[PDB]
């Protein structure tokens, strides 16, 4: 099963994470203030950085109670000794608009950041948006569809 997590590699540095049972998990996240959902660990590229995305459906920090919060973190990886540190690749989050791309060009909610080289987790073994999207905005369009949401984390490969 950990050898399953080692097969988890990004596709052109992209992870797409489906959070199903959205309705229910939001309720648990209201009932419990530090309820954090985790993506599978994934590699930026085959012999690269191991990352993991986390989300708070009912927000964290400045977003607590009001927003979806999205974070990413570096994990200990098998190949850390062959990589540049600190981790400095640009990270882009998207909450996907689940509309048919044959009808209209879907409008993803998207933010991008460059890792700050002073944050401890980006150095050799979460960081992101506490207020990524508001509870009111997430019910617009098709961000929530069939009781699931899609979180995308794309890591810019050199």
């Amino acid at each position: 099963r950990r050898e399953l997590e080692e097969l988890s590699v990004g596709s052109d540095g992209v992870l797409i994470w489906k959070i199903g049972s959205y309705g229910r998990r939001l309720q648990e996240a209201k009932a419990k203030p530090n309820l954090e959902c985790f993506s599978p660990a994934f590699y930026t590229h085959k012999y690269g950085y191991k990352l993991q995305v986390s989300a708070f459906l009912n927000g964290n920090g400045s977003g607590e109670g009001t927003h979806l919060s999205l974070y990413i973190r570096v994990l200990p990886g098998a190949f850390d000794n062959l990589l540049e540190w600190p981790f400095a690749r640009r990270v882009t989050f998207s909450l996907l608009d689940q509309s048919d791309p044959g009808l209209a060009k879907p409008q993803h909610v998207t933010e991008t950041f460059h890792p700050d080289p002073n944050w401890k987790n980006f150095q050799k073994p979460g960081f992101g948006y506490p207020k990524f999207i508001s509870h009111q905005d997430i019910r617009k369009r098709n961000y929530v569809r069939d009781d699931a949401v899609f979180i995308r984390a794309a890591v810019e490969l050199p």
């Binding site: 920090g61 919060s69 933010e111 950041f113 979460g126 960081f127 948006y129 506490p130 207020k131």
Partner: peptide, 5 residues
Amino acid sequence: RLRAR
């Protein structure tokens, strides 16, 4: 906009 936690 980017921040810890």
